[model samples]
Target chain A: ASETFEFQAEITQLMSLIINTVYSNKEIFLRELISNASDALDKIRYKSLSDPKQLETEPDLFIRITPKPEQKVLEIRDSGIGMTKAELINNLGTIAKSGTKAFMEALSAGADVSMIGQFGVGFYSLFLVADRVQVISKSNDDEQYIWESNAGGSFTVTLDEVNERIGRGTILRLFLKDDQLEYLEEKRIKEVIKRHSEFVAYPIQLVVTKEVE
Target chain B: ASETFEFQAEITQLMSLIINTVYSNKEIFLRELISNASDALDKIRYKSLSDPKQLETEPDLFIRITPKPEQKVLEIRDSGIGMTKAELINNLGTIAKSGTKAFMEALSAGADVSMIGQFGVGFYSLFLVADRVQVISKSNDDEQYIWESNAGGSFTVTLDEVNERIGRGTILRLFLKDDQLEYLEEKRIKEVIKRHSEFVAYPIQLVVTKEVE
Candidate 1:
């Protein structure tokens, strides 16, 4: 395991734009994150079709959310294809050409503009609500890696030596803002997930701890 | 009639954005301007219910596009509520409140970013493929004015003293780009208008210049 790599200048500008000025609706953050999870699940399902044996290890592809209000952290885990160190830098650190420009062009032509995932910028949406985000991933190709970002335009990627528990997937931990504590509520998070992504291909589970009266 | 004030900085930015980056698809310039014309007609039709005298001088509310390839100009004339000097500055020189914010928000949301008339920027879309645009308008309440823009981030307005023949309507003349000269073609412009805005309440007439064999 190694330390995280620094984020590029453009990434910093992009993160600031997203967190400070981009999305006006805070609720859309949940929608974007869930959509990312759904895409990961799709990738795994497609891979399973070609390599059935790979499916034997992780039979169920699911998204699990654990909200810790006491810790002021929210964790979202996905059982799908994880990213290696290089993939993390290429995919997370830089902007990917996700056909948003073409889609925007079509929309300017008076076409309906509904689907947003065409732009890979959906992943950066997490910074809208979270001050800091940490991604722990275990890929099939190499050792697990951890990506950390404060959403200030830069991120760091480091090798993770501890807890190789994630056999082949990713776990995202979000440090929620003080006012955004509502997202840590199990019911609220579940409601958001149901409204935006109930039709998601993978099963989404929430881990809640009820307090004793 | 007198010239209006200068456009706002945001308005200038918005105009350039629309003309350069927003409407990359040349066909959309035709669609959006036509839609704006249709909207103007709708507004007048709704107002006619309360004020019958408004239609006395202007009984027919129609939109016409005259394409002259030899002249390299495409003129879109609308018999909708025309703009006075003040109206032109208030409506065109400054971005509308709900429109600018909504459009900016849509873009930030990663929503299907369309070239909507958010802030009356639709008129500026003419600059996407036109080096020069002219607006001749006569309002029922005020004198006629001629507004011209090279779309070089600057515009000039003047009082049209001679041949004030226009009555309660606006006419826009666009000098087409060299490559976009095809928009001057009769068949092509007609097909675009019919496909995208056939349901417009106002009659849309296309004046095509035929080539002699």
Candidate 2:
């Protein structure tokens, strides 16, 4: 159940409002996204309670970033409560509002840490730098799906033929907007993560390739 | 649209999971909510660009809080873009994967030092102290509407019969959970506001009434 989806006009209206205004806090997108990733990992950690076997499937919950300057992409991935195909369409495909679907049933009743997003706007912060965004996620409840968008009032969702691109979690790949060339510096990513998301409850890591002469 | 709207089952499923776990960073909720209020104020300030008349409609762009101990409620009000009837339903009524709708158009834009809530989860942090949150908002584009919820699976929204409860903005009333009586002290609210939300660029004021003589 994967396909191309367009965000409703209202959804597009809401997103544009944020992008143009929050330029001052542009640095915040990283902290916010990383924190959200932590929240996702937290979801899986809690779910592992009632069904400990889920933990066996992914005993270690963490967050990672893969930066490819050659391709102009940065991926923020997490082993958290992965979204089903239905959730991807409704959550990211359009402006449906509220993102409780990923955790409500698996939420294990009581306590609020299960979810980090209640308003459904956190993911949109990527527009500050990314012109195009791709969400590749695999949930235990459903197969892998890709939700891609330009934040211009329309997005698409398609099924991922491969089985564990994310291994039952989520991967957010941001094609940084033009001229954000500073994004390629591996040192900068580390600086932002260390200075901003150091408070995150989970361990964060990134890939570092030796410069080949 | 005055009626009870049940958030999709998925929304509730994910909410309950975090409610029972992230109890440690509970104090962070106040900071988060206060920051969100500042963000709302920024939205209105930014929108004043195209339509300066709307700015004249609400020249004073700031955030205020009325702590009503009598009803065990705390109201965080802001004169911002507010929300339409449809906006309320999609924003607070259900849960999706992320909260892009809140800021994209509504968020892309702020100052008096706004744009603090770029990540968006800052608003959901209210559950740390509120069992019931009644968001009463009036937008320039729409009439007054209320989105009420107790973090339960479903929430409700309806038109406001009385005008000017919030002239041209939002008022978030948090019904303090049972036995959290310290919320009554005006001093405590001030302390939290300054200690936590001290970074807010706009002036934040609290209503003081002689210790309930």
Candidate 3:
């Protein structure tokens, strides 16, 4: 069973802004997600020093991108420290309730939200190319959980069974929008990676399925 | 008498970031503030059409820069729609508390505040060159108020007497830091304005005093 959470009005509107106006270079979404994967990898590396067993499930630290054109899905998977249930709700599910309402209202009331991206809503950049996204993650501290959102104002999180569990990190699967299908091309993904994450510490592999002869 | 208010933790740190790292071009601070002044000028224009009576205080729509090198002060004044007390507190005193704390905490905790300028904290950019800033503003809805800050933490709002108050709009006085005094030079300021805000709609004037010699 899955629990659903509604997004704050400000968050929904911010997502709309990110999808429509914020980034001039739409392909930076790949850079943002790749950077996020690298951060997760860093977290796990630090955690392993204290709890070496955390790496027992999957010792190799890497990120893999699997593009499935047939399913219209692009998956960026990382091997790193993952999130627990509470972490998911706090980190990904909601934003703080303090002054965001007023900030968004001021912005909507014609006050310039100039450089609004400085607020660090990098994750939402994914909305620029995908209408729906699913993040399946597993951690040593908690059960594997899947968080899914359609960018329509709410999201759902569900528990995954043991057999379906990921190693110890996150797999962000973007249900690519029809117009954003270009991201599924292997060469294009490699080009973006080269331009943006060429110096990233860990190996980022792209899985290319062999076509039938 | 003036009332004082403390800046949120995130705000103070964000100001520090702006003062130190964020802007590769320190000159953009002039651009941000000029754009702000233009926005104010535009606001008064919109309001005057609805209530021309408000124009009686100051019919002219303009921005003026008066640099006093003797006093080490740089003033940017504009005739435009100003702020009320509530507006001062709401607009300048505090930022929305919601996700901002988390957003900032994540940033401080090594989550890359990648392109942190997007959150639109342009007003605070003044701390780049000035150790202290004072903004005197008057709106039709309320008496004139002075908003002053040193960016140490707190700010003050004070009621201004009718005789001493500005006609309308705002006068931003920056107490220039010893090292950032180049902004007080007429030629340098003009260069900054020409480089960043040459195409602004309203006329921007710089007051030049006759040389004693």
Candidate 4:
């Protein structure tokens, strides 16, 4: 069955509110993104339960984070269900499938922290702490695709060669702004992982290669 | 300004639901009560900041819990702002002044768990686990009052005989059900206190008795 098209105006307001005033605690950005990664891992794990062959392609079901201080880049790679070009555009752009309104409404109403995980906008929270976010994803059923956003109400979608190499799941590259330099630190990133994602079912490995004598 | 009286019929139903269905996690009951105690301490501390005389009578700010295993009674005592007989019935009996509809609507619409503290229903959470509750409170404005309730849609308010002797603040006792006898255990009570009331600004002391050697 094909999906219908319609954007809710309230969702736009919600997006703007989220980008502007939703999270009073900026630290929650890390929590949200890590939660999204955990959810993604859960999806692939569930899928693997039905089709064991699905794990053959993406056997390493884990979250790997690499901090590049020189490039001012923080990369979070996860082996999970990747999105296609259309899925990326539909999911990242337009307020059709985005539950941004409900998420913002929950935050404004002072909802519980436990309840926020059930909402899917945790992925979009990356924008709260990053200047630019680039998602290189490859799905089993679809070709490679890239979704890039500056969180300024407009995003670009394109095909990427790197996405093709990554058999399944997503590689999120975050270009941190000047104010968000803390995210590039190994200590800060590790703290974020432990605080929010320690209980996550999948193993989250931090790859640090320091020069040795 | 005098507070207005206005609440939805569902306010009672929702209050009952919160006291029944919402808080399925029993550990949070102590957390909520401790949070309420911390709030009461905050109120008194804030008041003392302006007028040091407010702390003259009740100089110490503390939360104490006494678990009577034989009687299956758990008492949480706090040295904070207490309520008079009239105020106890009005505040505890009636819905919160700040619109219970909005509160219920927020809960229904899926609000955050942390935000639950922002709402004024922390005291009622005792009914979540306790079969009967008793509140012994002494107010600075008026005589002390004892509020007792089975939480079956009605409560009783009477003047406390210990009104003159009782110090400032309140002591809340919970009569635990047979199944809830775990709350009467010293170890279980200690764990609950540590988890919930650890961060409370005031001293939270547990009275321990040792056999004479």
- Name the candidate that leads on lDDT: 3
iRMSD in angstroms, per model: 36.3, 27.7, 34.3, 29.9
lDDT agreement with native, every candidate: 0.69, 0.66, 0.75, 0.67
Model 2, span B2-61: residue lDDT tens: 699887664564344335433444556667776777777788777777768887656666
Q: What is the TM-score of each candidate against the true structure?
A: 0.45, 0.44, 0.45, 0.45
* Alpha-carbon runs more than 4 Å astray in model 2: A1-213, B99-119, B162-164, B211-213
Candidate 3 on B1-213: residue-level lDDT in tens? 779888877777766665665534566677777778888889888888888898878777878787766568898888888888888887875766444455556656765443233445567768778888888888878888878888777889887642134768888888988888999886788788887676788888776542111
**Candidate 2, B62: how far from true, in Å?**
1.1
Instruction: Give the per-residue lDDT of model 1 (tens digit) for A166-204.
Output: 757888889987778889876688677777776676767
Instruction: Using lDDT as the measure, name the better of candidate 2 and candidate 3.
Output: 3
Query: What are the per-residue Cα lDDT tens digits for candidate 4 across B57-84?
Result: 6777877776655457888878788787
TM-score of 1: 0.45
Clashing pairs in 4: A111-B111, A111-B112, A111-B113, A112-B111, A112-B112, A112-B113, A113-B113
Question: Arrange candidates by TM-score, highest first: which order?
Answer: 3, 1, 4, 2
**lDDT by residue (tens digit), candidate 1, B124-207:** 667677878878777777777778776554566777643225656887878887878888876687677777775676678765
Per-residue lDDT value at B70 in model 3: 55
Error of 3 at A82 (Å): 0.8
